[PDB]
Amino acid sequence: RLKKVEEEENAATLQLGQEFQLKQINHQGEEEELIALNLSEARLVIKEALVERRRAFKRSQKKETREKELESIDVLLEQTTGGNNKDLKNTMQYLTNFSRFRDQETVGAVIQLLKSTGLHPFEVAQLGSLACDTADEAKTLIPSLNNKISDDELERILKELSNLETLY
Template sequence: MATRRPRRLNGIIEDVDASILKLGPEFEVRQVSNEGIETPLIALNLSEARLLMIAAMRQRKRELNGQEYDDIEIEEDELSSNEIVRKTQEYLTTFSRFRDEETVSAVEHLLKSPENANLHPFEIAQLGSLSCEDSEEAKTLIPSLLNKKSDQELQALLDNLRRFG
């Protein structure tokens, strides 16, 4: 079930195969920093992004208040008065599947297990963000999974993810 759609490139219509993951150089599995250091690509699912943003905002709030790291506990909804940051937090809170750090860690461990080693970090992030009911839905939303996982393997992974949500 490869999804194809025509694409115009320099006036020429090119056939694009959506089952092949073509995201551009910013999504190469190996990244090279400005200092020339090679590191693996980091792609976050929405739950991970939410936790990272909360931690960063808590740290920044503590620094602004001149308090030690463990002195206070700041509620998530009082972290920012900046409208853009607040709206981003609302979006992440609404659409993140997993709420606490332990669950996010368990999901990451599952998605990065050896049987999923052939998955691209972007695919892992999408599986962690989307609430796909079955393998057909997952392969429709993430067409690059077509040639990487059988329906049975993907369904078992989705069922395991659902246990955490």
């Protein structure tokens, strides 16, 4: 109203948009935390939503493995949604090639490990999406950490992530 100040610049100092708040609201009414996803989390959510879409589209009609995931996702994208959607195919193409964990079992422990340490869901969405080797690598690429997490305690998590890491 009446121009307003604008807020602040969108930065990597956890200065997210004036819309994407750390603690936001729900359609039901509850004060639910921000829902940020990594590349393994976001890949299993679109596949789940499109697997359950064809199940609902054909209900009304009544009355694992690396390269095998590439071709099965490509078929699912053509049936559930029409050719008009170009963005979704490029995203699902990019998500399956860059996912860190394929199995839904491993992802659950990854989220329990990260969403617990005391880090913003965006920092978790960035840790679970980018592969990091050194503690300093994660502290530089995700600069919101530094004081938020201990250098040796962050390395403890980074080691466990290589154990949780899936085979491609």
